[PDB]
Amino acid sequence: DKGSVGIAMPTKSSARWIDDGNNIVKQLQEAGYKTDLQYADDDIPNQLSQIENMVTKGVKVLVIASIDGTTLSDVLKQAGEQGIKVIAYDRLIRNSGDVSYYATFDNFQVGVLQATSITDKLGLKDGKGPFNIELFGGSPDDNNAFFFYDGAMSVLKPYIDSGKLVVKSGQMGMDKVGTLRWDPATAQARMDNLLSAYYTDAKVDAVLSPYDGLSIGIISSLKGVGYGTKDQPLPVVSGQDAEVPSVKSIIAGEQYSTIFKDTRELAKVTVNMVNAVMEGKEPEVNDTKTYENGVKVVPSYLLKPVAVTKENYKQVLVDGGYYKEDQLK
Ligand SMILES: OC[C@H]1O[C@@H](O)[C@H](O)[C@@H](O)[C@H]1O
Missing domain, CATH: 3.40.50.2300 (Response regulator)
Structure with missing residues (x-):
């Protein structure tokens, strides 16, 4: 009962996101978290609806690989009002001050x-x-x-x-x-x-x-x-x-x-970040300058x-x- 984590993946039409999803869930559950994994079939309205539901469900952390992150501003604001931390997964989420961390490849x-x-x-x-x-x-x-x-x-x-x-x-x-x-x-x-x-x-x-x-x-x-x-x-x-x-x-x-x-490595970084947030510690980041998102530079870890x-x-x-x-x- 380490808390619940919502994981939003964009589509299955690109092979990797199946692997990202499987690996994130496998490692999170190993770490003792409950998970809610959803795929949007590259439908922007659907992905938004999915994340909205994660917020209503009361997940503690959101891990989001967005189709178009700019569409998520309103729901991420609601997430922040509820104390939910947001990790942008692989793709940066733009136009939002409510993105806490960014895990990606260089x-x-x-x-x-x-x-x-x-x-x-x-x-x-x-x-x-x-x-x-x-x-x-x-x-x-x-x-x-x-x-x-x-x-x-x-x-x-x-x-x-x-x-x-x-x-x-x-x-x-x-x-x-x-x-x-x-x-x-x-x-x-x-x-x-x-x-x-x-x-x-x-x-x-x-x-x-x-x-x-x-x-x-x-x-x-x-x-x-x-x-x-x-x-x-x-x-x-x-x-x-x-x-x-x-x-x-x-x-x-x-x-x-x-x-x-290696999506297994990116899942591991994500779990490290989740662990840190849940323990009330600062996640490891190795780039705090590059990933400007329109509102701020999101602290990032690059593989x-x-x-x-x-x-x-x-x-x-x-x-x-x-x-x-x-x-x-
Ligand atoms: O899905 C198409 C591409 O999307 C990018 O955002 C991702 O970093 C790539 O690895 C590739 O999957």
């Missing part, structure tokens, strides 16, 4: 890693170039998407400036490359139209993809126009989440890279992500138990 660094996998593969440090690249971003209502993109551009921009990388479509910036709701179908269509408009004569050499779901759609589009044959190899395509279909793609020599974010390719998938994903060997066959 999102800027995720972007650095995605871009670096591409630049390393292209040999840009060896003076290789020029190459054509197209850019994709996440959902614009996901605060993480801006960090993934910015982190990537910290690596790519100097090469784009020098001409060694060329964005042939000229499309850059989250307002132009963002992919609403991280929808793979949308990214696939955009890739379709980039190819027809700008790559009838030229070839795509790389695509910055911020998420595995998108990477698979992008690859499908590329195969639709003849890439992925012996004569015409796929461009270098990044990713994130180490979803099984993308890992299989990487093993097959299609998708080039992904980013492994370090790991880049995965065909070269290291076994050691990173299987040896550490995230997946079993057979799942990747």
Whole structure:
């Protein structure tokens, strides 16, 4: 009876949130808490309704991975009036003074890693170039998407400036490359139209993809126009989440890279935070400057992500138990 914790996850259409949810609940119950885990099927009104009910139920702490956190201002105010502490999980909740802590991966660094996998593969440090690249971003209502993109551009921009990388479509910036709701179908269509408009004569050499779901759609589009044959190899395509279909793609020599974010580690950080709040102590945080949310800078704990390719998938994903060997066959 250490108290109840409400856990709001955005959707099951992206594999990780099932893992986040399972891992948070497993560790919280091990720590002796009761849990109320809900998934919103990416429906913003539903997620709001779910969190409202957690508040009415009288949970002591809310752990929220929001679809669009800006929609939660009113309910989080009510949570604060009731003495409920709020942990933003993975994605920062913006526009609210009632967000107490933020547990996440180093999102800027995720972007650095995605871009670096591409630049390393292209040999840009060896003076290789020029190459054509197209850019994709996440959902614009996901605060993480801006960090993934910015982190990537910290690596790519100097090469784009020098001409060694060329964005042939000229499309850059989250307002132009963002992919609403991280929808793979949308990214696939955009890739379709980039190819027809700008790559009838030229070839795509790389695509910055911020998420595995998108990477698979992008690859499908590329195969639709003849890439992925012996004569015409796929461009270098990044990713994130180490979803099984993308890992299989990487093993097959299609998708080039992904980013492994161990949800077991993020659940553990979250439990540490819950424990602290419940004991009346200050949670461990390692970043109190970065994550401005529009009202304040939320004290945060950042975990370090790991880049995965065909070269290291076994050691990173299987040896550490995230997946079993057979799942990747
Ligand atoms: O769901 C699409 C993406 O959403 C981001 O906010 C999250 O950090 C990524 O790991 C990925 O899951």
